[PDB]
Design a protein around this ligand. Structure first.
Ligand SMILES: Cc1cc2nc3c(=O)[nH]c(=O)nc-3n(C[C@H](O)[C@H](O)[C@H](O)COP(=O)(O)O)c2cc1C
Length: 288
């Protein structure tokens, strides 16, 4: 079993340490380990070393990703990696694509891409402003439907490398990812049970008559049973959940239909006239 550790913090900072401590626990379980420090990489925003990074992640049986917390969420770079997983790693599209390829004599895309995989996350912050990072982390796994093992948040963690019990927790997380990768099929989630019984998320978008889980997108109802929160949903919503094949197939077909509508709409005179007036009204300002 091959475990990859990734750190999005500063070189030789706390995320590196927690990540490496997780790698140590993974080796204790018998894993070969590798470490990638993202500050050594050049990665552009979704409109360069990304393909290299992706190849490394695809060669790993399990992944431990440690990210700083920026504004109560993961770093911009973590969000960029998530943006850029979209067109290459979506499990629905990759199943569709290799099916069309096999049936039309096309070229079989990369086998590694559809391989099952386990991943764990650690979010390390300076304070208690930490309420969005675990959902950001889940977002990265959601696209390829990698199986999350741990998804841990460390608040008040500037001095975490002298906090022995919290370092021991990174070590255990590394043991977990290693065991999980031994038998990916029977690997089991080890994290907080959360509120969403399906997602494990604690993040919700709330409107009248509809509570939406911010990770998996199930639409249902939030209950306050004396301060304890719970989340229910009609079972049929499971077909639409954003982290299932069924939900991804639906989502992708909606994108295809709506993209087709747009291409045709771009031919209309209404579209062309409005666009021409935008171009004539103003020119974009750029730095000299
Ligand atoms: C721009 C910026 C925003 C940050 N926002 C938060 C935050 O919202 N909550 C929090 O706990 N820490 C925040 N921090 C502190 C970082 O999480 C902290 O510096 C990081 O975990 C250090 O890790 P490193 O040692 O690996 O680099 C922020 C830091 C920076 C630079």
């Amino acid at each position: 079993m091959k475990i990859l550790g990734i750190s999005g913090g500063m070189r030789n900072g706390s995320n590196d340490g927690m990540c490496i401590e997780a790698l140590m626990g993974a080796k204790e379980m018998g894993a070969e380990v590798e470490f990638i420090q993202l500050q050594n990489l050049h990665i552009e925003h979704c409109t360069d070393d990304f393909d290299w990074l992706l190849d490394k992640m695809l060669d790993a049986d399990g992944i431990v990703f440690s990210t700083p917390i920026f504004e109560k969420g993961a770093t911009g770079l973590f969000h960029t990696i998530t943006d850029r997983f979209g067109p290459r790693m979506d499990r629905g599209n990759n199943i569709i694509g290799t099916k069309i390829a096999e049936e039309t004599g096309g070229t079989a895309p990369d086998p590694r891409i559809l391989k099952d995989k386990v991943i764990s996350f650690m979010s390390v912050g300076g304070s208690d402003w930490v309420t969005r990072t675990q959902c950001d982390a889940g977002m990265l796994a959601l696209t390829p439907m990698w199986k999350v093992i741990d998804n841990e948040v460390f608040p008040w963690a500037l001095s975490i490398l002298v906090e022995d019990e919290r370092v021991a927790r990174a070590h255990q997380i590394g043991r977990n990812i290693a065991e999980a990768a031994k038998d990916i099929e029977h690997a089991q989630y080890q994290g907080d049970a959360g509120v969403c019984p399906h997602c494990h998320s604690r993040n919700f978008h709330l409107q009248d008559g509809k509570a939406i889980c911010c990770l998996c997108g199930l639409e249902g109802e939030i209950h306050n049973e004396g301060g304890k929160y719970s989340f229910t949903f009609p079972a049929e919503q499971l077909e639409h959940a954003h982290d299932t094949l069924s939900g991804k197939f639906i989502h992708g077909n909606d994108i295809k239909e709506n993209t087709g509508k747009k291409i045709a709409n771009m031919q209309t005179e209404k579209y062309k006239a409005r666009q021409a007036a935008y171009r004539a009204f103003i020119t974009a300002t750029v730095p000299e």
